[PDB]
From Swiss-Prot:
Assigned protein family: Belongs to the ubiquitin D family.
Residue numbers marked as site, Activation by thioester intermediate formation with UBA6: 84-85
Taxonomic superkingdom: Eukaryota
Span of domain Ubiquitin-like: 10-83
The keyword Cytoplasm is assigned to this record: yes
Name the record gives this protein: Ubiquitin D
Keywords: Acetylation, Cytoplasm, Nucleus, Repeat, Ubl conjugation pathway
GO molecular function: proteasome binding
Compartments in which it is found: Nucleus; Cytoplasm
Intrachain disulfide bonds: none
Post-translational modification: Can be acetylated.
Origin species: Homo sapiens (Human)
UniProt induction comment: Rapidly degraded by the proteasome. Cell-cycle regulation with highest expression during the S-phase (at protein level). Induced during dendritic cell maturation. Negatively regulated by p53/TP53. High levels in various gastrointestinal and gynecological cancer cells. Induced in RTECs in common renal diseases including diabetic nephropathy (DN), IgA nephropathy (IgAN), and hypertensive nephrosclerosis (HN), as well as in hepatocellular carcinoma (HCC) and during HIVAN. Inducible by the pro-inflammatory cytokines IFNG/IFN-gamma and TNF in cancers of liver and colon.
Function: Ubiquitin-like protein modifier which can be covalently attached to target proteins and subsequently leads to their degradation by the 26S proteasome, in a NUB1-dependent manner. Conjugation to the target protein is activated by UBA6 via adenylation of its C-terminal glycine. Promotes the expression of the proteasome subunit beta type-9 (PSMB9/LMP2). Regulates TNF-alpha-induced and LPS-mediated activation of the central mediator of innate immunity NF-kappa-B by promoting TNF-alpha-mediated proteasomal degradation of ubiquitinated-I-kappa-B-alpha.
Amino acid sequence: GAMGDEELPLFLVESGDEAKRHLLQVRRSSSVAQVKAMIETKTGIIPETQIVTLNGKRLEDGKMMADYGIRKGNLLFLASYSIGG
C-alpha cells in the first residue's frame, strides 16, 4: 500500500550438502510454519520433517523468526529427520 520494507531475507544452508544454497525473503514475524512453507516451495521437503536451526537455536512450531532475534538475511541451517531406530 505504501513505501516500507517489512519482509527480511534469509539464507538456507543444506546440512547434507553445503553446496545447496538458497536465499529466500520472509518476514521475521513469520513463524517457522509459514517460513518453512516457502522452504518446501523451493526444496520440497515436508515441514513436519524439516529441521531448521537458527544461531545455535532450534526452530519450533509457532515460533517466529523475530523470536530468535534474527536479522535481515540471517543464516539458517536446513536439516531433515532420520530413521535410526
